Design a protein around this ligand. Structure first.
Ligand SMILES: Nc1ncnc2c1ncn2[C@@H]1O[C@H](COP(=O)(O)OP(=O)(O)O)[C@@H](O)[C@H]1O
Ligand SMILES: O=C(Cn1cnc2ccccc21)NCCc1ccccc1
Ligand SMILES: [Cl-]
Ligand SMILES: [Cl-]
Ligand SMILES: [Cl-]
Ligand SMILES: [Cl-]
Ligand SMILES: [Mg+2]
Ligand SMILES: [Mg+2]
Length: 265
């Protein structure tokens, strides 16, 4: 079906480990979209074709206002192309670099949208496992959308693929290579809530080795400006024992979230 000749390519939107993403326009319809380009040589060397397949299967079937749509894919002799919904307000990562910290209303609203999207995923026992700011995009009305489902799986699960860059958003069970489930995403949600309010993630350190230690021992502290309500919610999500982390409904009804969020469940 689709081929590269069907699109006009435009400015670069971002670069991932494997993804080179461009603005594009479909010629016959003028439909604007994001084209995610991957090099087959690189996929083959890293042995991660299976991740690209999970991404296609999961994101093409999901339908939720806070999850990025994947419309389709094609490939030629050297490259694979994913056809994605275009997110015109960019990444939460960029927004955080711009503002340094988010206020309590902005933070609680994003957390609400995240929890809504994740609740829909967990209802199918789909865990994302790679929730971080560079994979959270913003729609035309500023609404948050989860993207990059390449690390996702069905619970429960082990890990068979080599970890990549930062450990900052992963729970103890995941970095220690143990069995894991939906509760991995609840940990990441606590890491995000802290990073949104403070400007850096709670276990950030100078070295991989030190970051590993801070995570496995759950060593974090709060600056004075973080309020009692935010501290309660974050402390509940960042528990070593997964079964002790709250249900998403409990996040959605937490008094700090309901007091500060501008969006509903
Ligand atoms: N649909 C999109 N709209 C706008 N920007 C995007 C879109 N998809 C990706 N990007 C940008 O490209 C970057 C890499 O995309 P991603 O799908 O995360 O690739 P990887 O799988 O290599 O991490 C993102 O962090 C973001 O900056
Ligand atoms: O891998 C395939 C075909 N293929 C088999 N099972 C799949 C499930 C989902 C999508 C494609 C699938 N070869 C073509 C290149 C390619 C395209 C998409 C992702 C990876 C690689
Ligand atoms: Cl169409
Ligand atoms: Cl497994
Ligand atoms: Cl894996
Ligand atoms: Cl729930
Ligand atoms: Mg990514
Ligand atoms: Mg990926």
């Amino acid at each position: 079906q689709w081929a590269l000749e069907d699109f006009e390519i435009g400015r670069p939107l971002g670069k991932g480990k494997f993804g080179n993403v461009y603005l594009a326009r479909e010629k016959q319809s003028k439909f604007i979209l994001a084209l995610k380009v991957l090099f087959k040589a690189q996929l083959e060397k890293a042995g991660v074709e299976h991740q690209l397949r999970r991404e296609v299967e999961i994101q093409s079937h999901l339908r939720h206002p806070n999850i990025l749509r994947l419309y389709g894919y094609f490939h030629d002799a050297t490259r694979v192309y994913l056809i994605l919904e275009y997110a015109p307000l960019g990444t939460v990562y960029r927004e955080l670099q711009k503002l340094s910290k988010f206020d309590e209303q902005r933070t609680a609203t994003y957390i609400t949208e995240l929890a809504n999207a994740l609740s829909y995923c967990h209802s199918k026992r789909v865990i994302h496992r790679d929730i971080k700011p560079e994979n959270l995009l913003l729609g035309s009305a500023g609404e948050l959308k989860i993207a990059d489902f390449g690390w996702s799986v069905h619970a429960p699960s082990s890990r068979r693929t080599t970890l990549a860059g930062t450990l900052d958003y992963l729970p103890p069970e995941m970095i220690e290579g143990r069995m894991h489930d939906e509760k991995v995403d609840l940990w990441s949600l606590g890491v995000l809530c802290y990073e949104f309010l403070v400007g850096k993630p709670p276990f950030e350190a100078n070295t991989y080795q030190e970051t590993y230690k801070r995570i496995s021992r759950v060593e974090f502290t709060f600056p004075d400006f973080v309020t009692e309500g935010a501290r309660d919610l974050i402390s509940r999500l960042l528990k070593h024992n997964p079964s002790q982390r709250p249900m998403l409904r409990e996040v959605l009804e937490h008094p700090w979230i309901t007091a500060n969020s501008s969006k509903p469940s």
